[PDB]
């Protein structure tokens, strides 16, 4: 039936008006001296606790004064304000006490809202505290989310004071999990040692349970260092995705010992012409084809941001016109390998160029043309506040401008107006630029001297920042004139490119190049074969970030050999 909602809202606003002037107040709740007159029906039809307390037919339904203990006055006031309206005003300062009061009062709506709010607000500073909270209050979803977050950044959060005050079950369930993102077992060993020495008089009996969870006879990646590295070129990654899989889980190499440099191909293309905005991850070591889910809700024109902790992110976005410009934010995880929805921005960034300047992602322009107050708007990415504070905006429209941080100072070279993009002073001190006013200048983290190869015209200009000098190398080897499909990459902190200059058909000629700085010469690194690597585009996002091949969808879907000579 179409239950009337027009009468429902008038009755609700009338009940609120009556409650504000204290009419028909039949119950009086006493919390730590403070009195609150209220109606029994509203508390019953909102909280299952009050419903059971009133429907019992005892003196609680007859006495007008009810003393509620272990309940905060502010939380009870917020609950009543929800009981008489339904809108919840939650904040990061009083969300845990509100959730405690709700679970003590059993308000399904408030409980679910606080649960989802805590889930969508797990950061790397409260992960352990929220995990302890969920363990104390038995919230399985929040507990699992906080456990995954701790496993993702264990080496960064095991120093917090909340980690040493954890219970025994939390320790034995965190250490036993094979999802610990640690490069060496010594980190987990020292974490267990500091945990057991934090409070010795109460944990002296748990030393056996502590030592039984740390893998000592694992010898994951040291045994390969003992015998030799003798294998096909860098085939240690194949052993990673082999020995790990088949393991009794007691000597298993932790997930952090599987993290290996991976080519995160965001908004990439595939052999299928329909999937021209899909995603195919690649390993520059094991030479294997993996699958990726770069588009979350078919979100295109986004901006990949890999943090130093290897956490790929996205900015702005564009859903297919139901392109419908959207702002839904998404964070690519590594353990679950999924995009996490969060607070949307105020400006739709069209394929933005952003980096973690000073460990802090900034929304360096990466928009369109039509107003400096609307587009080209550098913002800030509040990590713990999960907010998007606006900062000094980019003066002119600068598109296809690779954003590269240099000495904790963004040095984004534009068409022909480079500035001193400051991550602290937020100013545009015109920095040494060039004379070629062109964009499409591919550049990755190349250290002191950056190289903005590209111009759609592939001059390898040297970008000296310390000496503030301006030299030049040469050009990309081609024929009469090759097509500039420069894709500057940074594999394991190196000066390389993914030039896809199509020559003799074969989709695009994917040839990686070796850039010299001390010799300042011109060489070639590797040559990605087209037998597996099919159409991938000419200027698509190709970030490089350490990722687990075990968690990466292991799906090649690309037949190698073709063109049989049988005819």
């Amino acid at each position: 039936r179409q239950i009337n909602t027009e009468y429902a809202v008038s009755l609700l606003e009338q009940l609120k008006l009556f409650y504000e002037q204290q009419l028909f107040t039949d119950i009086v709740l006493i919390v730590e001296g403070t009195e609150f007159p209220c109606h029994k029906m509203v508390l019953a039809t909102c909280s299952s606790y009050f419903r059971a307390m009133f429907m019992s037919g005892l003196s609680e339904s007859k006495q007008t004064h009810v003393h509620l203990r272990n309940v905060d006055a502010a939380t009870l006031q917020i609950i009543i304000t929800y009981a008489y309206t339904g809108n919840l005003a939650m904040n990061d300062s009083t969300v845990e006490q509100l959730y405690e009061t709700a679970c003590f009062l059993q308000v399904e709506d408030v409980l679910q809202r606080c649960r989802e709010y805590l889930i969508k607000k797990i950061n790397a500073e409260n992960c352990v505290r929220l995990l302890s909270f969920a363990d104390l209050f038995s919230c399985e979803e929040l507990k699992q989310s906080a456990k995954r977050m701790v496993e993702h950044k264990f080496t960064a959060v095991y120093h917090q004071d909340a980690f040493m005050q954890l219970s025994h079950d939390l320790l034995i369930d965190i250490l036993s999990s094979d999802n610990l993102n640690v490069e060496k077992e010594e980190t987990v060993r020292e974490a267990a040692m500091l945990w057991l020495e934090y409070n010795t008089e109460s944990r002296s009996q748990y030393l056996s349970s502590v030592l039984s969870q740390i893998r000592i006879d694992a010898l994951s990646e040291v045994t390969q260092r003992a015998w030799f590295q003798g294998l096909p070129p860098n085939d240690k990654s194949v052993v990673v995705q082999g020995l790990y899989k088949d393991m009794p889980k007691f000597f298993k190499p932790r997930l952090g010992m599987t993290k290996e440099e991976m080519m995160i191909f965001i908004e990439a293309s595939s052999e299928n012409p329909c999937s021209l905005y899909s995603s195919v991850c690649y390993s520059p070591q094991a030479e294997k084809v993996y699958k990726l889910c770069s588009p979350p809700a078919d979100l295109h024109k986004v901006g990949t941001v890999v943090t130093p902790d290897n956490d790929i992110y996205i900015a702005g976005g564009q859903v297919p016109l139901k392109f419908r410009t959207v702002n839904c934010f998404y964070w690519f995880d590594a353990q679950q390998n999924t995009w996490f929805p969060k607070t949307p921005m105020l400006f739709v960034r069209i394929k933005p160029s952003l980096v973690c300047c000073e460990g802090y992602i900034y929304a360096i322009g990466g928009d369109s043309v039509g107003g400096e107050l609307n587009r080209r708007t550098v913002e800030r990415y509040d990590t713990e506040k999960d907010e998007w504070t606006m900062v000094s905006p980019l003066p002119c429209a600068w598109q296809w401008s690779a954003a590269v941080v240099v000495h904790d100072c963004i040095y984004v070279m534009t068409l022909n107006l480079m500035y001193c993009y400051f991550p602290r002073s937020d100013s545009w001190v015109e920095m040494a630029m060039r004379q070629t006013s062109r964009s499409f200048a591919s550049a990755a983290a190349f250290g002191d001297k950056i190289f903005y190869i590209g111009g759609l015209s592939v001059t390898v200009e040297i970008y000296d920042v310390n000496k503030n000098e301006w030299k030049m190398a040469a050009n990309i080897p081609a024929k009469r004139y090759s097509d500039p499909c420069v894709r500057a990459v940074v594999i394991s902190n190196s000066l390389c490119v993914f030039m896809r200059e199509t020559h003799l058909n074969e989709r695009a000629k994917y040839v990686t190049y070796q850039y010299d700085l001390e010799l300042d010469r011109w060489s070639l690194r590797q040559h990605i074969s087209e037998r597996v690597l099919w159409d991938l585009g000419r200027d698509f996002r190709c970030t490089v970030g350490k990722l687990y091949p075990s968690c990466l969808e292991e799906s090649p879907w690309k037949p190698p050999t073709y063109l049989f000579s049988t005819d």
């Binding site: 081609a478 024929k479 009469r480 004139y481």
Partner: peptide, 20 residues
């Protein structure tokens, strides 16, 4: 042909050099 046309030799210009 995968070098001159790749540089920017328009097909119309190629037809002029193919017609003289």
């Amino acid at each position: 042909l995968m070098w001159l046309t790749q540089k920017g030799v328009r097909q119309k210009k190629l037809n002029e050099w193919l017609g003289n």
